[PDB]
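Budget justification note: compute hours in this period were largely spent on complex prediction jobs such as the one shown. Inputs:
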Amino acid sequence: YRRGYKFSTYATWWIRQAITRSIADQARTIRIPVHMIETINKLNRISRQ
DNA sequence: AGTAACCAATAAATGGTATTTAAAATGCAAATTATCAGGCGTACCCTCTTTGCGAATTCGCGGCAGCGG
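Corresponding output:
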């Protein structure tokens, strides 16, 4: 709290990180590593636009 | 334009028994580079809300249930 910021501002980053890291590790039968998941997500975001 | 198979002889006829030759080639296990795979962190503020809508008008049957003398 010494930083003087609202709690939610800090907490949201950790929550997003945890959720996304898990959805990368689990959720596939054959486990693609994290970095490849990031690259595939970039690929898909570029393809739509 | 000349008979011999006489008895020695000559080594050539083989395909078989091996310790060699070292060169090669052929494999073998290191060093040594690339690249992949994990972990951490992010400071304006954000606070039950999304769902399934229906393994979808079945039907007939059974029976284990709650209310009731």
